[PDB]
């Protein structure tokens, strides 16, 4: 599961 910070920032 991806939260918004995962979707936007985590490489």
């Amino acid at each position, epitope marked *: 599961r*991806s*939260f*918004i*910070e995962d*979707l*936007l*920032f*985590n*490489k």
Partner: antibody
Amino acid sequence: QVQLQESGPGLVQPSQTLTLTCTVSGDSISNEDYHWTWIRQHPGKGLEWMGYLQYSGNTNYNPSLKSRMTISVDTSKNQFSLRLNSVTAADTAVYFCATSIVLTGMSNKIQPFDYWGQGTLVTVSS
Amino acid sequence: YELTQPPSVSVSPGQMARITCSGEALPKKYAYWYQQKGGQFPVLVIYKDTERPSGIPERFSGSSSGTIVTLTISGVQPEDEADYYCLSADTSGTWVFGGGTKLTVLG
């Protein structure tokens, strides 16, 4: 696609509580996909992210502001709001409401801010 | 956590503009470049270090070198005169704007 409109600009006295609303049209404020966001910009200075709130209660606030600010929701009016305590001249800014959308099952998100208002000028002055 | 940009980049039309943004967490966190004109809400011109959104002119590009990311505008036009902000996050999940860079198109 939602349309966001901040409440009207004006004065707030030093040490008082700044209060702003953002009225959302086109979808429900209670939908968890939306990260209801506030951003501000002191005139002549840079942009500052303040934080977001989701209707579940999940929050993510700027760490320097987290003990001064609250984002909340008014379901009856389909609004979210900003409360900033004990304001000073440092808090004079254009305040923009915005939102960021996460759809269940999306794996590629392009826009950090999907929809936004055009800001409202709060002047902290006695 | 602070994202550091040059305060101003003064460039005549046609010259190449390069705006950097440095932060110690950029090797692990994507950067986003925003364009602001006339105090309005900023417009995304480059996302995830290198990608160009649709409707954005091809003259805008972006690269990454670990702790420093660079927005590059080839064929700078008078319309590109704006303030530019990088957006990223720290390792705690706080979204962070860079200090902003004023691109002046002199001449």
